[model samples]
Target: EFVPPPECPVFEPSWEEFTDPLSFIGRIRPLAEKTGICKIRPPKDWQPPFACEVKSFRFTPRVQRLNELEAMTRVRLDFLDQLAKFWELQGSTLKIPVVERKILDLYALSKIVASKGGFEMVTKEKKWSKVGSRLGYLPGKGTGSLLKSHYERILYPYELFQSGVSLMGVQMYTLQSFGEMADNFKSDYFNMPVHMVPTELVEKEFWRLVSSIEEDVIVEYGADISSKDFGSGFPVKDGRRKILPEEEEYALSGWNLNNMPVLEQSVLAHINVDISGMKVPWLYVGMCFSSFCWHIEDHWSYSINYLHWGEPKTWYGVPSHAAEQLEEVMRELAPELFESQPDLLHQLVTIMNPNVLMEHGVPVYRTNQCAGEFVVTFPRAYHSGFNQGYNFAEAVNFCTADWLPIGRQCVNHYRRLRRHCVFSHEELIFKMAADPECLDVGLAAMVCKELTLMTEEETRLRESVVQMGVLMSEEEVFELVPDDERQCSACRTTCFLSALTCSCNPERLVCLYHPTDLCPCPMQKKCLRYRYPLEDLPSLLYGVKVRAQSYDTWVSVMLEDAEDRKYPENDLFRKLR
Candidate 1:
């Protein structure tokens, strides 16, 4: 039952507001942020041609069997059925009682360490039921024990059934093939009887149907595929391809998904290091049950997805403020999944019913994003969606000034959890500070505020490390350091400005946050590796402060000139609250 959450807000931006995509997004941020995601309907006359030739495009289609839980659920119920028949026969023939416990929660069961700990689903409503030492007991010696041995032979010293290959991976498909599949797929799916069917009953029965002994159902679809292999749906100026005349304007910044990542007001532009896939657009081609799982963007940056053509992609969202709450609910229900893997969210397989989230007090908002609309997700917002049918969508991640503080918080939280950092936040800040010429006044102003906070915190850390009797100091260009190499051993945080290292091992390091945890060696051998001298940081902060002020003054000077005055009423940047 795909009962959607409350509809997210939709706006029809005026022609002027539609002109610059990032600026239009910034203007809508305050309102859109509350819903987590919003739909923007471009101006009536603004229909960008679907420049792609559908038949020419080919993609490796990933399969997704519908009812992810059902396959395992069936075998679980089946084994119990087979177990009952065996026990039923013994009781009938020998007239003895038999007590058995089977693993009903097959999905959560793991075979790690030659075996692993888990729970069972014993009730109609899904919950992890405690089931310890599942071996059946025997009342008498010969016949009872023989049955027990048979049970033991079938069950223990066993790895969980892990289906491989054909039960896995993908196939190469043309857009045409996927499209035809999706069209029929929806017609077949919608034929299910509903409204009178209670959700839990339907869910249970659906699981049973897929697992029923007579049936073997493995549904498939075109799942989320990035454009890295095939390139973006939007026009690119890599100087490798010729652009169609109608696509000329789209090849420019703002309108193009490729350039949206590096827009001047968007903070991803300032990073000296390549963000790689995170900074580029991914083209997602979807069919029925083809879903992008619930996840926040890397570093909690904003993401904007454009459903270029075909069906409406249904989205479920929880606001940024409820991110932890959503996680709490998901964790409580699927503790096994979370406990089984550290990279749960990144895997994009953390599937759940939206109503479950809503019932548990996480506010959910949703929108069915149709063709020619943009679905913009805000910083830290949790979102997931399924394509209605055959569809093509393009999306890219971006960050704005409003997202800077949370970006820092996200990195700090990652370190606290001992997770890897994608890129250094401080590197982006200092890089932008040095090249303030590239930033707009508003972006510079926001960066200055965040920069001041960083300066204060860096100084505090340095002072504390010095008092710890740090012996040596050396300047290191963290910017030049490969992303994998600069991580702290203690927290796994990227050490952008400074880190503490011990001679105990040459490669091991710790960020300023974890200096005390770095080594067992005496303080004398430990060295403080820094990017710039502490004395120079304040001057750097002040430089950004001056840059923002100067840029604002320069803009004010232009405000009085005729060229800008003619278009003064139309700048959405100035008009935004």
Candidate 2:
């Protein structure tokens, strides 16, 4: 009864398209966007030699759930509810973002917010039975503060991987031991090496094992094990370590993941601030059914992963356009998920059969990423997968010129949900705007469009907040303050362009969008903290505008000369140049 989803498209690029990963991605994006995921095969001769020495290497592991549960046990959900009440008694509240009691379905909650003005308005009336944090929040005796541990607790990998139940089944110390053990189980237990294990066979039974009535304790090896342990599975140039001479090619800028977030033509390249966990590629050591959950990349940025060596990593994807539809199906099926966390996407737990989604009308795509192949997920696209067997992979997120408008939309979406932003979208835009010559023509043109929209919207918001009586205006450079220091107390949006601060509290703020929500204090007690004066925004936009205009004129004059026969044939090549 477990039917598989359709397979996602796969592209085999020649050396030319393979040279520049970004341009190659754009070429296939139109067709691949329909599925929101795609697989790419390098040209026959284009292998970047796998730099990892399997037998000599060691990595600690993390146990992953293959559908960890149908839903977390009822007791765990109840305990959270009790804990929230205790926090309320302590004059502190847990950040239960679900906006409803554990009892209501997503369908009913829609009318609650829709029938009302909005979530902020509905919350103003009252809201969550989903508890997002315990240690996530700290009790503030009036002024809120959270103190995170400054040090990390290092666990002995020896005891963890070498013992029974160290990682999933046990900590896999020697790679040879785990590989032979699993291969033995396949022939004896299921009968074969997984390449011939029939992708169809695994997909069917993968669903079967998770859906069983009896509690099946599925075990698999996963290594997100070390905390900041092995940085990237690929070679990265660092002053700290000497890489092997054989690994030299991977350390180059284009192939190097350490430079991915700042690649030429990448929008994230313009970030002047924020260590967003963006640049460093994550190393995933995998075992059969070793997996993570369904989710989009942070900031909805595009994510590309390369499987260095492996059998296959089975993946399921939902297109970017259907991301919300995917959420609705998930929310209805697992209301407890909403109860436990507001930003359900980041939970990084729980697994669902693609059949469940397809049955609910969301189109799904599947793929098996084998050794040396790459898999990519587009901005805002949803993807989840498990390794078919032992493997090593490296993946990272990057934003493109097309992602600029989407990133802006993502920030606006986060503001409404009161979700934390990875970085200020406006702040990144301004950084690029300041020196537009660094941008590609298409990218600069798009910045002009997005910047104009942001400036006009920001101007309108500032005007309204001023009208609402935040009369004291002082220009404070938002870029100078640490992101956590100046946040909208009500919405949790990181303030960059402007913020409203009250005399009653030293550091509390609300973005111009949430002026009314900051505090109970009268509006007159607040001050409008801005990055620049109101009149200054237009000139800022003009900088990018000038850069954008220059490119168009340059292209225009060449086109006129080339097509109209306005010059001698000998002179044409110079004008083209």
Q: Which candidate wins on TM-score?
A: 2
RMSD of 2: 12.0
Compared with the true structure, all predictions reach lDDT values of: 0.65, 0.66
Against the hidden reference, what TM-scores do the models get?
A: 0.75, 0.77
Highest lDDT among the candidates is held by which one? 2
Q: Write the per-residue lDDT of candidate 2 for residues 354-454, one digit (tens) a residue.
A: 88788889989989898878898998888987777777788888888889899988888887665778778788888888877656666788988988888
lDDT of 2: 0.66
TM-score of 2: 0.77
Superposed Cα deviation of residue 362, candidate 2 (Å) = 0.4
Rate residue 410 of model 2 by lDDT.
89
**Residue clash pairs of candidate 2:** 130-339, 161-171
Q: Kindly list the per-residue Cα lDDT of model 1 for residues 1-577, writing each as its tens digit.
A: 4454688999998776777777788788888888888988877676666656788777765554454423223343344344434434434211112234222222223221123231111222221122212221222323333433332333221222222222111111788877777777556655543222333343333334333556544444553456566777777677667878777777774767778877767777766656545777778887754666678887888888888888677787879989889888755533544443333324324556677788889889988788888888998899986665578888888888888889899998887665777788888888778876656566678888888788889889988998888868988888777877899885888888888888888778888898877777778754999888877566776777776777555556345432332222344446443
Lowest summed lDDT across 10 adjacent residues in model 2 is found at 145-154
